Curated annotation (Swiss-Prot):
SUPFAM superfamilies recorded: PUA domain-like (SSF88697)
HAMAP family documented for this protein: UPF0310
Protein name from the UniProt record: UPF0310 protein PH1033
A Pfam entry, by short name: EVE
Protein family: Belongs to the UPF0310 family.
Annotated organism of origin: Pyrococcus horikoshii (strain ATCC 700860 / DSM 12428 / JCM 9974 / NBRC 100139 / OT-3)
Gene3D superfamilies documented for this protein: ph1033 like domains
Length: 143
């Protein structure tokens, strides 16, 4: 098996939730090739600003299970300034849906080596493998 944390934002999270699809750009197709049916996905939305200008901190919004082998589909379901379609995809199904702030978990997450500059572990990543302990920690807090 394999646990993963997928990095997106709130607008794309809504699409993910509606279409039961996790997609990535070509540059990250390599990572997706390792994904298998049954793998677990922790959905993460990065820090953003609402229209009003208010700060929306990062947080985990759900957990899904992969149900398909990776495939390619250029359908325009997502939304980038650019025109990326995130054609490299795997079908998924929801295990649990609930939101919890991410920051408070940083100290307890094993994959985050540098607590100071944790962004480092997210930088230029679409998704990354999570150690089992980390997954369980999140699973519990999201029950």
């Amino acid at each position: 098996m394999t646990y993963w944390i997928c990095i997106t934002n709130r607008e794309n999270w809504e699409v993910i939730k509606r279409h039961n699809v996790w997609g990535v750009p070509k540059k990250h197709k390599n990572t997706l090739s390792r994904v298998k049916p049954g793998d677990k996905l922790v959905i993460y939305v990065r820090q953003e600003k609402d229209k009003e200008g208010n700060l929306l901190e990062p947080k985990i919004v759900g957990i899904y299970e992969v149900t398909s082998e990776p495939y390619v589909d250029f359908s325009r379901i997502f939304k980038p300034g650019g025109k990326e379609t995130y054609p490299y995809r795997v079908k998924i199904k929801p295990i649990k849906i609930g939101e919890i702030n991410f920051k408070p978990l940083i100290n307890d997450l094993k994959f985050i080596k540098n607590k100071k500059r944790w962004s480092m572990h997210f930088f230029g990543k679409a998704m990354r493998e999570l150690p089992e302990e980390d997954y369980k920690l999140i699973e519990k807090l999201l029950l």
